[PDB]
Amino acid sequence: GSAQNITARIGEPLVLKCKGAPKKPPQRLEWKLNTGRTEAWKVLSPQGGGPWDSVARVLPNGSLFLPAVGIQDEGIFRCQAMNRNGKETKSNYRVRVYQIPGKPE
């Protein structure tokens, strides 16, 4: 549970897990995803019901499911959770699509 390498293809579905939120129900938590070069980063929420067809939705267990990750969606995924103890759980998952930009940021 720390910077996991995940390979994917443009238009292919991909799922991510957030170290902290078990099979439990959809509780309080924040979701963030960084893609593109720098101006493509978007904030994901536990309420993806609807726009899922446009982007993706968040699982009830605190996970992330994508219907089709595009080349623009390529980048790094970051998730955060909060336990009853007061401590927060961090989770970073690296995602790579088929086609690449070429030059790094």
Side-chain angles (χ1 to χ4, degrees), residues 20-29 46 58-63 81-82 84:
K23 271 91 79 72
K24 257 77 214 145
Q27 241 84 48
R28 191 186 272 284
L29 50 75
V58 162
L59 282 172
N61 44 286
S63 262
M82 170 148 282
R84 67 190 69 163

Side-chain angles (χ1 to χ4, degrees), residues 10-78:
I10 298 153
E12 302 317 301
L14 190 68
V15 187
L16 294 185
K17 189 159 284 154
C18 301
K19 264 71 216 156
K23 271 91 79 72
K24 257 77 214 145
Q27 241 84 48
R28 191 186 272 284
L29 50 75
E30 216 62 275
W31 232 109
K32 212 152 76 208
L33 151 67
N34 164 227
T35 85
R37 267 71 58 80
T38 197
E39 293 155 14
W41 70 295
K42 333 90 68 53
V43 178
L44 271 287
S45 16
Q47 189 60 76
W52 72 287
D53 193 10
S54 351
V55 271
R57 19 68 80 77
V58 162
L59 282 172
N61 44 286
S63 262
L64 176 77
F65 182 103
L66 300 80
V69 289
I71 212 226
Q72 59 154 119
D73 262 30
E74 79 180 272
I76 293 118
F77 288 64
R78 324 199 185 185

